Design an enzyme around this catalytic site. Structure first.
Site, PDB file in Angstrom:
ATOM      1  N   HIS A   1      12.704 -39.207 -22.542  1.00 49.00           N
ATOM      2  CA  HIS A   1      11.387 -39.146 -23.478  1.00 49.00           C
ATOM      3  C   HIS A   1      11.142 -37.942 -24.113  1.00 49.00           C
ATOM      4  O   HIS A   1       9.989 -37.906 -24.847  1.00 49.00           O
ATOM      5  CB  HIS A   1      10.309 -39.750 -22.462  1.00 49.00           C
ATOM      6  CG  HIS A   1       9.679 -38.965 -21.821  1.00 49.00           C
ATOM      7  ND1 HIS A   1       9.883 -38.708 -20.385  1.00 49.00           N
ATOM      8  CD2 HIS A   1       8.480 -37.765 -22.054  1.00 49.00           C
ATOM      9  CE1 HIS A   1       8.865 -37.713 -19.839  1.00 49.00           C
ATOM     10  NE2 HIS A   1       7.967 -37.325 -21.071  1.00 49.00           N
TER      11      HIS A   1
ATOM     12  N   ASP B   1      15.233 -42.337 -17.490  1.00 53.02           N
ATOM     13  CA  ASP B   1      14.792 -41.274 -18.310  1.00 53.02           C
ATOM     14  C   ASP B   1      15.521 -40.213 -18.169  1.00 53.02           C
ATOM     15  O   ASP B   1      15.242 -39.061 -17.539  1.00 53.02           O
ATOM     16  CB  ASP B   1      13.115 -41.090 -17.871  1.00 53.02           C
ATOM     17  CG  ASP B   1      12.466 -40.061 -18.929  1.00 53.02           C
ATOM     18  OD1 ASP B   1      13.031 -39.816 -19.903  1.00 53.02           O
ATOM     19  OD2 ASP B   1      11.137 -39.821 -18.518  1.00 53.02           O
TER      20      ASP B   1
ATOM     21  N   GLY C   1       4.004 -31.444 -20.365  1.00 51.84           N
ATOM     22  CA  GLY C   1       4.498 -30.284 -20.939  1.00 51.84           C
ATOM     23  C   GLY C   1       5.744 -29.763 -20.050  1.00 51.84           C
ATOM     24  O   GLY C   1       6.616 -28.958 -20.204  1.00 51.84           O
TER      25      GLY C   1
ATOM     26  N   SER D   1       7.595 -32.129 -18.336  1.00 52.31           N
ATOM     27  CA  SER D   1       8.586 -33.060 -18.701  1.00 52.31           C
ATOM     28  C   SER D   1       9.860 -32.874 -19.176  1.00 52.31           C
ATOM     29  O   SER D   1      10.034 -31.643 -19.746  1.00 52.31           O
ATOM     30  CB  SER D   1       8.204 -34.267 -19.744  1.00 52.31           C
ATOM     31  OG  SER D   1       7.030 -35.069 -19.547  1.00 52.31           O
ATOM     32  N   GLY D   2      10.843 -33.289 -18.491  1.00 55.53           N
ATOM     33  CA  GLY D   2      12.432 -32.750 -18.525  1.00 55.53           C
ATOM     34  C   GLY D   2      12.922 -31.752 -17.624  1.00 55.53           C
ATOM     35  O   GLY D   2      13.979 -31.545 -17.814  1.00 55.53           O
TER      36      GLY D   2
END
Ligand SMILES: [Ca+2]
Length: 223
Positions: free
Chosen positions: A40, A84, A175, A177-178
């Site tokens: 995402h 994801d 923020g 994320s990942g």
């Protein structure tokens, strides 16, 4: 990261910032050429920033390297966030050193109750907005499958796990994320989603990296 602590410059040397004119997601360096992040977080036009502490100051240990290729998982579902996970290839290899270093992929899946290190430049408030410039860190335990499913009924797949605190107050956030969830020294999770941040009964949900090691290895052996 809500309820976390300032990591300390370059103490999390596998943490990257993905930049498209501004920081928008984290990632993890898994070798000199490749970053793991969340699908995402896909954007076209990504520059990977390694060696960062303050993302708004050039402090002298950074490497800024454009992505040449991004590869979202073949089964990514952006509605449910199942699978994801994304790979990003760097245009040129990073120079590995004490501040820019890779994290190992896991051999086994982490256990419920294990305390992991989650990090990022995301929002630090449960209610409202404040984005730090320096990297923040949080130690959070993996929760049982049953607890995760109870928190998010009908939403958790076998490719997700929950980690955090059901009382609230400590979580990853927008923020982050990942970015990495590191347990026993290996990359076990990717910051993926959650209902708000740090709310009671709504822990963080993370992509279960151990289910993707054979895809990651065959993809990097081919690209
Ligand atoms: Ca910097």
């Amino acid at each position: 990261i809500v309820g976390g602590y300032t990591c300390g410059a370059n103490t999390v040397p596998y943490q990257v910032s993905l930049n498209s004119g501004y920081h928008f997601c984290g990632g993890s360096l898994i070798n000199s050429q490749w970053v793991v992040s969340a699908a995402h977080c896909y954007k076209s036009g990504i520059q990977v920033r390694l060696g960062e502490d303050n993302i708004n100051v050039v402090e002298g240990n950074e490497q800024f390297i454009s992505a040449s290729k991004s590869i979202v998982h073949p089964s990514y579902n952006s509605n449910t966030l199942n699978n994801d996970i994304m790979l990003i290839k760097l245009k040129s290899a990073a120079s590995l050193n004490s501040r820019v270093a890779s994290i190992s992929l896991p051999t086994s899946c982490a256990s419920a109750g294990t305390q992991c290190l989650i990090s990022g430049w995301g929002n630090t408030k449960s209610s409202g907005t404040s984005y730090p410039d320096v990297l923040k860190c949080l130690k959070a335990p993996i929760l049982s499958d049953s607890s995760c499913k109870s928190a998010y009924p009908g939403q958790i797949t076998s490719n997700m796990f929950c980690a955090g605190y059901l009382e609230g107050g400590k979580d990853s956030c927008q923020g982050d994320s990942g970015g990495p969830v590191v347990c026993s020294g290996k990359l076990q999770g990717i910051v993926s989603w959650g209902s708000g941040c740090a709310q009671k009964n709504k822990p963080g949900v993370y992509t279960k990296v151990c289910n993707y090691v054979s895809w990651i290895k065959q993809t990097i052996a081919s690209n």
